[PDB]
Design a protein around this nucleic acid. Structure first.
Ligand SMILES: Nc1ncnc2c1ncn2[C@@H]1O[C@H](COP(=O)(O)OP(=O)(O)OP(O)(O)=S)[C@@H](O)[C@H]1O
Ligand SMILES: Nc1ncnc2c1ncn2[C@@H]1O[C@H](COP(=O)(O)OP(=O)(O)OP(O)(O)=S)[C@@H](O)[C@H]1O
Ligand SMILES: [Mg+2]
Ligand SMILES: [Mg+2]
Ligand SMILES: [Zn+2]
Lengths: 339, 432, 432, 432, 87
DNA sequence: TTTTTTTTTTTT
RNA sequence: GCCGA
DNA sequence: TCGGCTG
């Protein structure tokens, strides 16, 4: 196919549609829009189910509201016959010639730009009194005290962010959150996560990046010799020696260092097929993945094991060190464990 | 070492002429290597030669790949270059890599097979073999080698042909001299023999006659019944070897004292083996089940089989094709393949019986184009017979054997012969 | 289910008497289950009996493990209960667990073998086998079915076989001398028999005649009316038993006084049994529906059918196959196999009729090949009769029954015999 | 692709002299490509010779070009190499590029024509073609092919056809004077031939001999055998080639020393071809298979055959026919058609055997009507030789060969001939 | 009353022997109850008998549905319990 | 790839 | 539509 | 109340 022309024509033919948004991440080109086939919902104007994905080898317009998935050419034929003919002609026009899109291959990225120096409205956990409510909550979390020097407590999280990244929130409503600063390899904070307190925070539990190129892996500065264990929760990583945690919905293997010795320690849910998908994509790369297939505990995360089933960190480490499998060996445990 | 293999596939000729036919797209990773091999294979198909780097660049430009795929393939091709090396290490290392990557793919396949097996019905998909097929696949992968024998090459393979001339395989003799004559001394060990016939005309009768003859010949016989109880098959064998009619057994004409006396007279005979009859429900046993039975017979009863005899081939479970998944031809062909594999493994002269098509019933002659469940049996079987007792052979108390498929001798020498099948004694005699 | 396996090992003798032969420490786990089974194995080795919970705890105290293993084994031991579940389900489930864990172990073993093979000979481990052992390692892991039975021996079990011969409890008489004579004691339980005939030649007439004959012999008969209605079938049965020409019945030649007298006279007989007739819509009943009917019968009334007669097998609808999922040959043979399985489950003679293709609907003789439905029906069946009627036979009121397929006895001793069918009475009369 | 085309125009003589007549300035681009081709055309026009790279650079030096155009042309000129690509792929790829660009140009032209049409007629371009000529223009787009060879054109290829006549480019001799006499030079390539065996003739023997004679002439032969084992067919080949009687091979009269000596003596001769025997199960080989076998032989053994002898036509399988029978007219007709299609597409001579009726058996004279597979095989078989053996000819060690159907020559010229058949040597010799 | 129906389907031979032939999958729900009845029906087909709670737990462990469905079925089975009742 | 009904056709 | 806040 | 989610 011709994905770049597909993206260009999709942008041309979807910009005028209401609730259009050109969501362009460094590897993905997507368009959000209210689907003209269905119209989505009057309440769900911003919750527009019309999506276009052009990052694939072909451009596909999919709407989950009316369940309409189709190639971009079909949409052009059904809605923009003039633009349809334009696209269908120009695709053949450039089809004969060699693809030149690789010629302007430039990187607009930048190095550390918003290096985080100090945290207003934040008091570190080890600096707090033993009867602080957050301290009691983390006692319930059973986090070892020595690592409390890595977590802060705040009450002005929107204010803190707008002091770091102004304009994030139109209102700086005071909000207590657990600020977990995410540092780089050299030890300087490149982002920070406002972990929700109590059962759940009111809104917007998100990790605020200092800049788009900031790291998403927590604890990299504390990585020592030996195998590196990759987990899903920074608090969970706090229970793991040489344990880093990826912070984000995107899982890129290239950005994660220690290709030789990185070990993926994921959740203990054989169900939740997205987990199985992640496991499969990791094993297809021949990566080192830990398997909970022989775990005596049946909780979800390591901290859950500790809190609910009374697991101890040493048991966790010995299970991880004895349950690392790679290649076909990993695939066996993956296959048996999934269901 | 995929880069080296591709480099010497492109920049070398002798390496290609030696290694190309065995290469396949399944032997490379899903990244740039597989796409490069796809382009190379497409060019070779289209022009019958190895392309040049410029040709590969042209094909890549005129290809439907992703930006990542296009960049990777271009980078790999740019990395390709001729490394001057010896034409002895390259071939062996390529063969090693092809075997290693064949085994990885095979293993992944058996893992997928097990995953499919653990799936519940309906939800589980198809076009994937059953768990029982897992060993056979693992046999293929270990057989991959760059020395392929495709056919007999006259003036090139003359040592093997002369060896086949002078030497002859060991034969397990029958007790009927007619079968020895039509098999030049007997049946070879690692063979799947079948006694085809019509329905209720003597499939199991012939199998039991062979079982009784082989028991009298001192071999160790296992009779696996799928349509008859153990008592029924053992009664057939008793009728054959004690010269007592089944009517006499059912009516009780022979006294238990005489029965015990005959049994002791047979037991005191030194040249006697042990025949063991095992029953499984119809569709409840497969080749794996037969292997488990052999294991327990070697352990529990300390009995090593020599003549495995299965009552009905078409009844047995495929052992490799999920039950009620494919058609009849594929299922029965897989059954025959599994049974022959077991026979070759255990070095036992296996016997079974297949059912002819409805056209052959009550017909004075049958042939290969009459097998009901699958016509693939003669391809798999090594010695097949027929029974043509239609209208007047029974009235004359005789039989007729077509010798449909004979891998031991020339089937068109004694193709049709008459056997005096005695139904009351469940035995075969010779008309001479 | 490891906890269940250990609990039923400790607190059951029957389970231990059939699953301990097939048990290895490599099956269960590398955790507390492994050490618990090791304790069980040690306790049975030192003293040849199954331990107790107190004995197991004493053994654990005597044995040495790490604190974590100690706590885990103790916790598992505390979680053991009798729980006297079903035996069949228990053995089947533990067999499935053994097979799956054996497959997992074999696959891990071959993976380790390949991993060692990739290593340099100096670095690699000599203890593991070579790659050539990958196939057999799989098949030995596919032959671990739970089956301790080796079967008969023909030499070490001749007395038991003679005792089995003496047990004629399988045979059921026919109330007709000719049928019993040609079946050597009549039909047997769980044995499918087919009385095939052309359209409007007397299939259901013969089936109702057999139902009446079995009723006069004290059995319990279940007549499954596939085409007619309940009242009509009962009318035919009355025509046979109450000896009143079916027509007379509709022409008032039997007064209600005489009908009541005959019915009460038959009720007074102590040798009379029970006959239940069930009508079913065409293509709406089979082994699943038949077993539902069986359970409903056994609950509503103290009725256990000794004979199961099906009005026509072709009218039935296959259990697994949909109404017209596949061709006639697959679905009808599936129905035949399901009915035979139902018969062998309930240990009842299952009679049914079959239709004949148009080639023999007016022939003096009908052969086995002339089965209108699947040719698998004259393969899944046992005692097959064919009913033939011509102008001369109709004038003589004598249907000709041909012993087309005879599993019970000699198919050629009396192949064709004239029956004395009186269509007015729906009765068969032997001819002397 | 433009860079490669320009480079091989500059630095080649055969490719230029082949592809120049079909190159136009509008085929390439509106930029560097068009200007470079304009320079090439100008140089080849002013001086009737392909410019050199420095000549092209000089032409660039003295020409009307803009600064950007000058830089682009200079860079492209410096980017021209003398890469020695293969010829066939280069021709095919440049033809594909030319056709694609011609299609793009024609599509753009018709689109611009339609755009011009939808304008006020007072304000339009007169030079633009009218709409009614649009189907013609696209035709000119598709009238672009570098090599215009579609079928054999009479009066335009009389020289090539005469060269084929004189060179006998289709015939393949038989090593027997009689066969070449009755075929005007032997059998022809891309043809099928059949031997009609009579009452016991041995279909294998003749195909065996021809196989040999074809071997002694240096032709690559492949004997796909069905009713025989590879060793048996190769043994017949040995009998024909080494002058050793077939039964002597079985007895052992000829020793290993003499056998190996004769084999090496034959190997010393440079006029000896290669024979590849491949076996297939009876009825398990259709024509399509043979195609895959040829692909494998060409790819792996580099064996490109010119003679393909299949053991038996009736034993073969139809390529796409579900119903199979031992002797059916539709099957033999389909098999003959498919085998002849295989022969045509492979440019190879194909031989097979077939059986005739009993009327042909009893009578020495055999008519095309007196053929079991008449109308069917006669229709698709280029050559048909009825091989008949009579008792008098058996005593004289001869056979009566009759040319039943000769697409090669007149039937009656030399119809019947006595052939010196030696059954033990499996050899055919001429008769003085 | 699906919980009661299942509880007396398991812990009662008399109730089962009557109600089972009429019972079918489409009679309970689209949630846990349907899956529990599916497991019960599968076991009944396999062994011609009512499974115990342990057998149902074994079947649930060897099942394919999601974590939500698994939790629902486990909760229902744990909530299954015979009570003194009349036929 | 078998398998069965029905019809239609054709060859021996 | 499902999930997260 | 928001964003991100395969076919
Ligand atoms: N008890 C018996 N007494 C005498 N002859 C019998 C007896 N049982 C079977 N036969 C004969 O055995 C012959 C063939 O029976 P089988 O051994 O079943 O042959 P078959 O080909 O295996 O039949 P199948 O298994 O149903 S396809 C029939 O023709 C009967 O005459
Ligand atoms: N009520 C009746 N009165 C007299 N004769 C009858 C009666 N019912 C059936 N018959 C005769 O019985 C023979 C067929 O009847 P049935 O056995 O009921 O039919 P069937 O054997 O089920 O076969 P089909 O194909 O279903 S009609 C024929 O000779 C009929 O004339
Ligand atoms: Mg039998
Ligand atoms: Mg009827
Ligand atoms: Zn929509």
């Amino acid at each position: 196919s011709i994905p770049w022309i597909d993206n260009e024509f999709a942008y041309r033919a979807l910009a005028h549609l209401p609730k259009f948004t050109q969501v362009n991440n460094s590897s993905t080109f997507k368009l959000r829009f209210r689907c003209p086939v269905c119209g989505d919902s009057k309440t769900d104007q911003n919750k527009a189910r019309g999506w276009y994905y052009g990052d694939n080898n072909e451009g596909n317009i999919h709407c989950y509201n009316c369940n309409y998935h189709a190639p971009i050419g079909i949409y052009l034929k059904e809605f923009e016959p003039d633009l349809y003919r334009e696209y269908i002609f120009e695709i053949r026009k450039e089809k004969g010639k060699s693809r030149p899109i690789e010629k302007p291959k430039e990187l607009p990225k930048q190095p550390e730009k918003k290096i985080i120096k100090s945290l207003p409205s934040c008091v570190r956990l080890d600096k707090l009194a033993e009867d602080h409510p957050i301290i009691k909550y983390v006692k319930a979390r059973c986090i070892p005290k020595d690592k409390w020097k890595y977590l802060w407590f705040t009450t002005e999280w929107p204010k803190l962010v707008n002091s770091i990244a102004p304009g994030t929130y139109k209102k700086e409503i005071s909000e207590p959150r657990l600020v977990i600063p995410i540092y780089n390899a050299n030890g300087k904070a490149e982002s920070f996560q406002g972990r929700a307190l109590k059962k759940d925070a009111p809104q917007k539990y998100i990790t605020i990046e200092a800049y788009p190129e900031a790291t998403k892996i927590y604890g990299v500065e504390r990585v020592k010799d030996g195998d590196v264990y990759v987990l899903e929760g920074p608090i969970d990583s706090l229970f793991i020696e040489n344990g880093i945690a990826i912070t984000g919905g995107q899982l890129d293997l290239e950005v994660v260092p220690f290709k030789d010795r990185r070990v993926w320690v994921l959740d203990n849910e054989p169900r939740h097929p997205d987990t199985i998908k992640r496991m499969t994509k990791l094993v297809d790369a021949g990566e080192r993945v830990m398997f909970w297939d022989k775990s005596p505990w049946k909780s979800k995360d390591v901290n859950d094991m500790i809190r609910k089933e009374g697991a101890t960190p040493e048991q966790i480490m010995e299970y991880m060190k004895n349950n690392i499998a790679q290649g076909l060996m990993a695939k066996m445990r993956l296959s048996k464990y999934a269901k | 070492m995929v880069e080296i293999i591709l480099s010497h596939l492109i920049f070398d000729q002798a390496y290609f002429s030696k290694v190309w036919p065995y290469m396949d797209s399944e032997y490379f990773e899903s990244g740039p290597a597989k796409n490069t091999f796809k382009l190379i294979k497409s060019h070779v198909n289209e022009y019958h030669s190895v392309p040049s780097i410029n040709a590969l660049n042209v094909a890549l430009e005129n290809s439907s790949f992703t930006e990542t795929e296009y960049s990777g393939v271009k980078t790999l091709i740019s990395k390709l270059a001729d490394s001057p090396e010896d034409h002895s290490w390259l071939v062996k290392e390529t063969e090693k890599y092809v075997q290693q990557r064949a085994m990885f793919n095979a293993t992944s396949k058996i893992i997928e097979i097990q995953t499919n097996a653990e799936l519940p019905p309906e939800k589980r998909n198809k076009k994937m073999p059953d768990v029982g097929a897992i060993p056979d696949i693992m046999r293929q992968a270990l057989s991959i080698s760059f020395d392929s024998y495709v056919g007999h090459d006259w003036m090139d393979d003359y040592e093997a042909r002369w060896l086949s001339y002078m030497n002859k395989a060991r034969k397990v003799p029958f007790k009927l001299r007619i079968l020895n004559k039509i098999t030049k001394g007997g049946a070879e060990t690692g063979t799947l023999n079948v006694l085809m016939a019509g329905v209720n005309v003597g499939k199991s009768l012939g199998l039991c006659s062979l079982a009784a003859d082989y028991l009298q010949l001192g071999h160790n016989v296992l009779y696996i019944s799928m349509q008859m109880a153990e008592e029924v098959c053992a009664k057939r064998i008793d009728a054959n070897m004690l010269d007592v009619s089944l009517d006499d057994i059912d009516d009780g004409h022979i006294s238990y004292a005489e029965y015990k006396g005959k049994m002791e007279k047979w037991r005191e005979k030194s040249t006697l083996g042990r025949l063991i009859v095992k029953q499984y429900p119809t569709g409840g046993a497969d080749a794996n089940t037969f292997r488990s039975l052999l294991n327990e017979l070697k352990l529990k009863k300390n009995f090593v089989p020599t003549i495995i005899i299965v009552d009905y081939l078409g009844i047995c479970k495929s052992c490799r094709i999920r039950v009620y998944s494919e058609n009849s031809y594929t299922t029965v062909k897989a059954i025959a393949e599994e049974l022959r594999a077991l026979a070759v493994e255990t070095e036992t002269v296996l016997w079974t019986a297949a059912q002819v098509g409805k056209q052959a019933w009550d017909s004075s002659d049958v042939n290969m184009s009459d097998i009901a469940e699958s016509a693939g049996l003669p391809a798999t079987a090594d010695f097949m017979l027929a029974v043509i007792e239609t209208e007047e052979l029974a009235a004359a108390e005789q039989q007729l054997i077509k010798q449909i498929k004979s891998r031991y001798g020339d089937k068109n020498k004694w193709n049709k012969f008459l056997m005096g099948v005695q139904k009351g004694n469940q035995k075969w005699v010779e008309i001479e």
